[model samples]
Target: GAMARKELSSLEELFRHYGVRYMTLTKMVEMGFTVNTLVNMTEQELDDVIRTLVDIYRVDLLVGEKYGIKSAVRAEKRRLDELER
Candidate 1:
């Protein structure tokens, strides 16, 4: 889904399911994507950061650590459910 079209609830839902929301937000803060900073970033910049996050953590590992499932199936489900397109 496009950043412009995303609502906070859906995004939070996805992140919560993966258990990466907290970590992801922490990393984003480390990378300078804090609320104030993000508000000023271009859509492309936001997209790039999100992509970088996914690349760095690999949702599978992130979600697995949270549930002891060692599988990214739930993460994938959350992503698919939250995405608009």
Candidate 2:
């Protein structure tokens, strides 16, 4: 392979998966949130800080816990369907 693009880290997968859709992980770092810190917080802690909901599910999914199975479906579907590139 000649100069492959770096893949997003699992933490990148979290925020880009409809997290603070505007807040890039680098910006998150600018705000002092390391990927390790984000995943270690409680679900409510995430919500309390981010000030959001349901869609938060798979954003949390990448962190490895969530609410509904259907939310899981949409998360996979969005990522897969768009990768048709």
Candidate closest to the true structure, highest lDDT:
1
- Tally clashing residue pairs in candidate 1: 0
Q: For residues 1-85, write the lDDT of model 1, one tens digit per residue.
A: 4442334333344345444455554454445433334444555665565566678845333444334211233444455558956
The residue pairs in collision within model 2 are none
Residue 49 local lDDT, model 2: 47
Worst 10 residues of 2 by lDDT: 1-10
Q: Quote model 2's TM-score.
A: 0.36
* lDDT (Cα atoms) of all candidates against the true structure: 0.45, 0.43
Evaluate model 1: give its lDDT.
0.45
Per residue, candidate 2 scores C-alpha lDDT tens digits across 1-85 of: 2211122243455544453333334334444555456545665675564433334422333333333222333555566658966
